[PDB]
Amino acid sequence: SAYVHTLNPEATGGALVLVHPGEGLALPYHGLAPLLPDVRLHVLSDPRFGQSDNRFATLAEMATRYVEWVRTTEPEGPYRLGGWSFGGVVALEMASQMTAHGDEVSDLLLVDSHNLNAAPGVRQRLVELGVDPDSPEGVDVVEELLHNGALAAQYAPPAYRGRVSLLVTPTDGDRDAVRARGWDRALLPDLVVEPVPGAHERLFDEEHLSDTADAIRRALGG
């Protein structure tokens, strides 16, 4: 569909599905493609983005719909899923569902994601992106953002035994980066924690993209 876009379509090194962050558009990930030229990148956008009505009721329901798309695009596994912040949380729930239905998910990439249901700026994020929150783009994005943040707050991530890479930016006061983001290592026995530099909101902007892509490449090459 119009919400699934595939980058590096002739790549033969494997595939990676990336779920949109809380703003709802997978466009930040497009700049990864030249930096991950051996990876088929399937980037997923929110199909309910423009719809004040007909939002997904739960993060689980969103994930279930995205799984469908993934299976249609890559009918055979093993699967590698991930996303930046909110998208990483959705990717986890996708991995949880796929593995419960017999699929192999060899990698799950949480790019500086947090678990708001455990450890809980809408307009200010756009201002920081250079968009007018009150422009036509602006209002839709803030609306999308607050809903996805509500989906995340109501969702608790389940125990998941597969391999999970959590890429973490610097943690205020250098405290434990896993608890600071609301995750419980008892639920993620095969968690691997990897550093990525810069600020949570800046990870895909022009300056940062090469370092963020480096951290993703390293996470996938276990």
Numbering used by the authors: 1695 to 1814, 1822 to 1923
Task: Copy out sentences from the published article reporting this entry, exactly as the authors wrote them.
The NRPS enzymes that produce the β-lactam antibiotic nocardicin A (1) exhibit several unusual features. The overall structure of NocTE is similar to known TE domain structures of NRPS and polyketide synthase (PKS) enzymes. The NocTE active site structure with its catalytic triad Ser1779, His1901, and Asp1806 is similar to canonical Type-I thioesterase domains.
The lid region of NocTE consists of two helices (α4 and α5) that are oriented at an angle of 48° relative to each other and are held together through hydrophobic interactions. Interestingly, positioned two residues downstream from the catalytic aspartate (Asp1806) is His1808, which forms an additional hydrogen bond with the catalytic serine. In the unliganded structure, His1808 adopts two alternate side chain positions; the principal orientation hydrogen bonds to Ser1779. In the unliganded structure, the only contact made by the α4 helix to the core domain is through the backbone carbonyl of the Glu1829 to Arg1903 side chains.
